[model samples]
Target: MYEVKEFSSGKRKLEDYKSIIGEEEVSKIQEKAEKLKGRSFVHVNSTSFGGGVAEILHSLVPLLRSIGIEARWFVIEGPTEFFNVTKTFHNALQGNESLKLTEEMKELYLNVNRENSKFIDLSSFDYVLVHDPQPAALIEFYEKKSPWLWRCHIDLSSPNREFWEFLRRFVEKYDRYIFHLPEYVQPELDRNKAVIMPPSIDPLSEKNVELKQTEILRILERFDVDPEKPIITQVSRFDPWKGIFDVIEIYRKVKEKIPGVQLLLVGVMAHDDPEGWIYFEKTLRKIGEDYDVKVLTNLIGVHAREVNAFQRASDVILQMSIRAGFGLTVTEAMWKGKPVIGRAVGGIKFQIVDGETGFLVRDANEAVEVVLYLLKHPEVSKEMGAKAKERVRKNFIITKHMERYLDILNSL
Candidate 1:
């Protein structure tokens, strides 16, 4: 079965974003949306909470409705076994080579999708957009009366050949294919159907909003994070590909040089990701007896407000992902005027300008060097943070995201 997700679009209007992005940009979105005012759109994904896709939809779906476009979000329901298979597919598509995909795994994926399709009505919407591999097979089992777009939010430049071929059967059936970057597109797919649209962060959201000095200090105090020490933070789901172990190593090395330094590994446990719990436990065990290292998550009360406080309170943010789609945390940190040191891969490469907005490193060694440089030179870090915020304002914001979606629909 599938569930429809209800989100409060909030009192914030397209006009509310005008103050940050400018009147002209907001006006462009309104004009583009005018023509497609009554069009219906539905977005399907595996989960309604945690991860970038869910966070984006929470802002996007409501913004779409505000502009007079009828938008709805649906999350597919499946057993733990089905998600286990999809999680494996997720890692494989992102370049995890060792995992074996058996025929039984393939059958479970399709069978679960087949069951989910029966509960949802996809025919009436003017357009249907499926996110990632979890619900990708829905197109095969459901009646198609509208144009379907497969929006992939992961790096697929080097996916397992067998899994790629298997999923391509359902993918090719979609009317369009969307990705965060052009390089992420597979060479074998039809280039004509591919579109490159990077995801955005809500500037007005609690996660990115500007926090007062007192409020930030209070939140950090509540978590027992020392305000006087230099804090380095990484906010992401606790997954292997996110480079959690590398982050811990980087922190240990940084602390050797800067003794007062503290590391905050804040992550969220998404319901759809069964592997997250395993990784979270692994991270805690790995940090045994390290009092300066704080591993926090949503389960322990680190919500959007706390995440915002952490980023604002820290000296530098790190997103050392081994492989990534588009690191929204990088965007969120940048939006908060904080310099982020992310690995030079996937969308992180596209987001940071390397030494201007932020630094890009390859490994724990390289990451440690950048982290040291930023902390030692507070003036330089502050300047880079200012530029980072400007970069996000011009390129990555909710209004620009809405305009791109309307552009694609208008072409159709």
Candidate 2:
């Protein structure tokens, strides 16, 4: 944090560095938590699979319970048709013009929310946190007596106007709004009700933890990841916005420059999104044996230890998401002290610090340069790995992350 003392005459780094809050801060927060305590903090999102919202719910529910808060996560049922429309609405509201958000798309979006609301226990929760536009209209159907929050974790720096305007109808209803990055808080954004709470990762969770050797071998053997070669892994849904193609472009360049450098892209995507499955199929058809690409949707039998083992085993981790809501993959990899390469977009810029912890790049060439440079200089890479892990501990771990959510609930 930068402090400009005396109205920006000069600037200096301000360290409000508390891993956990002080008793004084706790007392201040306690006043609010006392009100929220024992209240059902229900979170409703569109899908149970894919995206950061789902990831956060996995840790946050039990986490809230550990502190005497009853937090519950709810997912609204929708077919692939509904998700596709919501997905387009997501990109549109986030400041893209590619979507011609049609009347049909709008109608289906409302219908899904209308249908899903019938199943939701409207009166069962204290503070209702509805996530994203997929179920944003759920705020409209709230028969319950609770505060509603729309947790927006998307790239909205330049969203399409037509989409943005359409979604704004839903956005205005929420008493709370969550943004991933600070810059995302625009004049058009709901400042009076908005809260800039970034997404977080649980270090103790199955997705990001220390792994055993046996567990490591089991995961690798199942995925066919070659142990002899250096592993550069990117764990993200198979979305075009995730910069999967960007990684492919970089991988091709790296292969051309150096031989026997294997790359593995590993993550489980939505079972519901046919687009994801389609993308996965296409990616499989495109990648060659020379590249050693593997998309591990084999999580059915695979243990959660597989995620940690892949992180620990990897010499380099890459997150090339073109439109990311902070990319938890960056944090997960950083927690393990693996050198990361992330796109200079969304919340990714905040995570991967160039040269110190990890590298941030805008284009394919920069991506290739970072990967090759880290590969060649193993010691520098190791230093980066160590620093990266510490960075995640200080900035992005569960304690700070959980406290933010708790704080928001209190303030509201």
Candidate 3:
């Protein structure tokens, strides 16, 4: 059976965002949502925790309800074998050509969805939205009573031919396709059906909210992180695509120049992502004896508060993804007024304005150079951090995300 996720989003009001996003933007959202009031929205995905999709839904679904829409969230349940097969599809769809999907894998994938389809009834909701490839086939197995949307949150610019072919049949069944960038839309799909909407960070969430200096210091001290030393943090999943090893290499080089520098590689292990454990172990082995290099995960009590403290206390933030769908961590760091140094890939390219808001790099070497420059020059770093915060304010907050969803629903 699938699980229902209940959140405290009702506690927040639309007017609460007026100060950060301006009264005009909040009023505009209120006006738009008024047209769609009482409309039901059901969001289905694989997991209720971990990853960007879960994080976004935590804030989005509640905000939707706050605006007079009836919104609910559900997470599909499947066996370990099913998740392993779906993980392969996720990697291949993100441009992993080496992974192969066998006939047995395909059979298990369909079987799991067919079983989940029995438990989740989406016929009542006005809009049924499925996130990622794990539950994409739910649309295929169940009877669709309303407009169903496949909200893909990955970089699909160069997906593996076999995987893409397998998922395309199910993807084409949707009324609307949502992506983070225009470049992510596949060539064969109808361009008119594709909606470009980037995911957002909630300024009021435990992860992005402001923390006092004493609170930040206490959290850092609990983790044995030196508050006085220079710190660089990369908060993401333990997947290979996140460039965890590359971050370690960059941190080593940065340490050579600035010996007091410390690196914190933080991530969360989602129940649906079995591959995360494999990569997390690999990351631990890679960081063997380096005391300055600390690895933190939810297993060791590094929840949102710890993550927020680390990002707030860090000197700079890093997102070294090889292929990304809008790196939410970049937005999270930016929301906290920290300059991020990320690789020049999919969504990272869109977030960072080269040298303006943050620095975009190509490889570990380029990232190391930028990290060194930021550490050496505190004034420039501070100025860039200010700009980064403003960029997130104007573009990547939850109010804008709610407005976009209302716009899409109104058009329908």
Candidate 4:
């Protein structure tokens, strides 16, 4: 049976956001939470660590309770085979990769969903938010009275027709659906039923917590990165779509102009992502012992504090994703006041203001150009970094995320 891990509400207070956002905003959040005070919320996803959804739930669930909601987070259990099928589903839905969905694969996905559903009291909660497609079929099996929301965190702008229709059988059953960007909204689905709610990060979390330069330098030194040299880093799971190879190419091109540049590719393999090691090994093979280049996974330093330290130490951060759901890492780096250069796709278009908060790139040449310019002009980059921080403070912070969720619940 799949275990439902009930999380205990921790010590995060709604008052904390007052110091960052202001009292007026926090008061509005509380006012909205008051409407859904007695209501219960349940969030189900595949993994509890390594990905943005779990990271968000860890911070959001506690804050939801602080505003007086009985919110619970659960990690849906599945065998490796189930996850493998879902991983393929993940790739094909992104429309960048394709997989033949055989009848056997569909059965395994539904069978796991059937098994996991028995362990959850699906009908008891007022609202149940199922994250991504891994557990989407539970909408069909659970027969729950609660209003269900299929929160899609991936890029579904284009999908395999057969696969999309198959998953739609379960997804369309939900009372509402949520996508990070409006472009990700499937045109075939009811537009009225789709809610465009972007994903966010927690400033208070270990990953985004502010660190002193002394602490940041000490942490970066552990990885043997030269503190004096310009550091360019991209933090993401090692995947083909993340463009790790392109990053290496960009670093090489940038190094052509500035030989002292050091490149660091930081990522962590989530428990459920089966393709992580395959791509990570491929990335390492391509690097092949290059001294200026470093491909370090979570095994080296997976802690969020370490990630925060890495972002703080770097001069420029790049997230050249070919396609992204919301690019939380881009937000994380921007929150640290580092000038970010991200590909203009998915939720990134909303985050980077293109030469204002940060620069947006469409290819390796564009990435190299922006990286070089930022590296050359420290003052201009610093100004953009300051604006980047303010953009995140106003839009992508966890407090704003909490307010949106409460409004969603109040609507339900």
Candidate 5:
């Protein structure tokens, strides 16, 4: 069970993430929190340069420190092939079973984990969080019984049976954790040890903040995106699970009638999955011929300001992932007062309030209908956007994010 408590007076709004949960929730959480006061904690994941996991840590670590919780982040090293296997595990967890992974590939994956675990010294920390499957196996070398947990951040309710069982070996050994969203928890795992905490988006982060109208215009102009056209954007990596190509197919059908809308697919790639660059190149080649279409995969060094600008400048945003653990961008878009159209799968379902907060779709055609629906009802779109932003401000800020993480730490 989660045992963390939130301190009422230690919360802040601008930078400190512990502030916004309100006194009631904070008091309850803090009471459960052992308040390890000066105890050390560390978070380990495969990549530090890309994706929501990295971005979340960037906001979370500092917030934890602000409250006097000693928190640190560690990145594990792995070669491309090793990452490709993890990617396979990622897809299988998304319900794609025929990922064509070989035994040698699986061996290479575990070997990399064993090698990375050799340098980590975890004996002193009060808690250690291993983010996702890349470092889930690292629990094998805990060095001590510090409360190590596997923080799963993806949709896993209907994972490929074999893949789920295989990863179970890694998770079952840890103080378990989960990104608990409605109907998305996998029952096959050890439910007793499992904790259902959801991931969050920081409102003040570059990818989710207020943008000057001029700044938004300048960004669009620089990208050759025309503000005259309604923008339909999907912020995600080139991964197939995110359904980027399907988004492209949906855009084509919509443009056949609307004819003026533009689509922007953007996000950085984490090299942990060796196939990332290859998959990115293939997506580029397939979508390359279109002039109105744009893709962004190699955004590792790029500033997140552009992402914020794009989402703010756009008319609509979507996190149409085929299977999402939790679509952080969906929350970010909502935070921005932008109407988001997301797939009705995984944790994404928890974010979009169907016809109320945002639209939910299942296929490219359904996605096209959403675009048509929004294009027809501009006033309705704006109203939904307002509701979405308020929802995020009230529920998805970093303070709330830290509250969740703080709860996890205290529970441990």
Candidate 6:
């Protein structure tokens, strides 16, 4: 059998938002939360770290209980072989290269769910919110009844057809399905059965929290990054879909026009994704010695503050995902009041206002031009940064996320 890892409660209070959002916003959340005083929630996902789902839930679960809901999170366990299969499923769902799912893999996935079902008690909660495909089949193995919501945090617009049909058997059992963006909703699923609740970030998290230049400098020095250099940073998993190759190519093109620009490619390996290290090596080969490039992984002790320092130190932040499912790092960087250049895909289009918050580019050529423009104009960058942070304050913070969760729970 597998283990269910319990996350520690977050220390952030709703009143803590009096400084960021305002007192009224915090009051509204508290008022709504009071309406559902005894409701319970359980979030099931694949991992407890290295991905946005886990990061958000760690902070979300505690904030949830702070408002009176009995909220808890559990991660279903799987063997390395099972995760390798799911990693293939993850890439296929992104509409990437097609990988055939074998009968053996399907059986293994089913058996793993059967074992995990022993620890998962869906009947105990008012809402059993399962994240992603890792533990999706738990509903079938679960005997007790409850409102089950299957939340998809990946690009599911054009999922692998045969594989999707297999997964649909499990997903069809859910009370509702959540997608990051409307376009990510599959054509086959009835629109009436779907809910669009995009992912959000915690402003108070160490990754997004404010940092002084002195602290930023100390953190950078610890990691061997020159705090004074004009740094260009991209913080995400080293997955192929993240477009690390494209980021490197864009950096090389921009380097010609703007010399002495350093690129810090930082990433954290997710436990469920076994292909991360291999693909990261492939990316390392593509990165040459001609430029100042530092490739990092959480394996070398990368943490949230290090991420905050990188974004704070960066002159331009890049989230050029080839296929994005609402690049949370885009929101994180933008929330930090740093100008970002991201691809015009998925939920990224929602966060970036194009010439206002940050520029949305289609290709490396477009990215280089936008990067050059931002670097050349400091005053313009400052303006975009202010507007970007305000955009996050209005739409992408945890305060709104909490309200949305309460509304969804109350609806049930």
Best lDDT among the predictions, by candidate number:
1
Summarize candidate 4's per-residue lDDT along 1-412 as a digit string, tens digits: 3433443224677876679888888888889988888787988889876566776776788788778898877778878899888988988897844578899999999998888888877768899888999989888876678799999988778898778988999888998999888888898789988898888888777788777888888887788888888899999888888888888999999998899999989987765566888888888888888878877677766567777877788899998889677788888889989898988887778899999989988899999998989888999999999999999988988999888888788786
lDDT of 5 by residue, 1-412 (tens): 0111232222333234334445676555444434666767788887755566776776677656655677777788877888777877888887777766567866887788777776757656788888888878777765666787778877777788777777788787777666657455577666677776767776556666567889888877777788888788888766668887888888889888978878888777666566667777887798878868866444533357888877876787877787666677788788777888888876678878989889888777888888788878989999999898777766676666666666667665
Q: Candidate 2's residue-wise lDDT over 1-412, tens digit each? A: 0111121111111112233334554354445456677888877776554555665565556556545676667778878998778777776766658779889888898888888787756556778877777878877776647778788777666778888778888887788778888776656766788787777776656777567878788778777777778777788888768888788878878978776777777777556678788888788777755447666664344334676777778888888887777777888888887988988876788887887999888788988998999989999999999998888876787656766777787776
Clashing pairs in 3: none
Q: Write the per-residue lDDT of candidate 1 for residues 300-344, one digit (tens) a residue.
A: 888889989988888999998987778888999998889999889
Clashes of 5: 17
Model 3 bad stretches (over 4 Å): 1-5, 8-10, 49-52, 74-81, 95-121, 140-145, 238-257, 270-290, 363-369
lDDT of 3 by residue, 1-412 (tens): 4655565444566766777888887888889998888998889999876565677787788788788999888888878898878878988898769998899998998887888788768867899888999888888766777899899888888999999999998999999999988889998799988899988888887888888999999988888999989999999989888889999999999888889889999987765567898899988898999899989888888888889999998899999998676788899898888899998877788999889989988899999998999888999999999999999988888888878888898888
Candidate 4 stretches with Cα past 4 Å from truth are 1-9, 47-50, 78-81, 96-108, 115-120, 141-146, 239-246, 270-290, 299-303, 362-369
- Order candidates by lDDT, high to low: 1, 3, 4, 6, 5, 2
| Candidate 3 accuracy as TM-score | 0.84
**What's the lDDT for candidate 3?**
0.86
Better of 2 and 6 by lDDT: 6
- Tell me the tens digit of each residue's lDDT in model 6 across 1-412: 3333445435555766678888888888888898888787888889886676777887788778677888877888878999989988888887865689889989999899888888757667778888999888988876546798989988778888877888999988888899889987887777887899888888877878898888988888887887666788898888778878889988999899778888999887765566888888887788856448888777788777788888888888998888777788898889988898988887788899999999988888999998888889989999999999999888889888878878887787
Assess each prediction's global lDDT (C-alpha) against the native: 0.87, 0.73, 0.86, 0.84, 0.73, 0.83
Q: TM-score, each model? A: 0.84, 0.74, 0.84, 0.86, 0.75, 0.86
Better of 3 and 6 by TM-score: 6
Q: Clash number for every model?
A: 0, 6, 0, 0, 17, 0
Model 4, residue 396: displacement in angstroms? 1.1
Error of 4 at 240 (Å): 4.4
TM-score, model 1 to reference? 0.84
